[PDB]
Design a protein around this ligand. Sequence first.
Ligand SMILES: [Zn+2]
Lengths: 21, 30
Amino acid sequence: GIVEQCCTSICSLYQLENYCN
Amino acid sequence: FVNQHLCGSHLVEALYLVCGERGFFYTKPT
Ligand SMILES: [Zn+2]
């Protein structure tokens, strides 16, 4: 999920936005 | 925006900031 992308790796605000509602 | 590794509590604080009004969803660890 989020962890793998943004924690484990790094994210783009854009990628973090896939996690909004 | 930060080009950093956002983990644990920093992860959810980022998402609160980034989702705003709409809110977000945090899922269970793989
Ligand atoms: Zn910390």
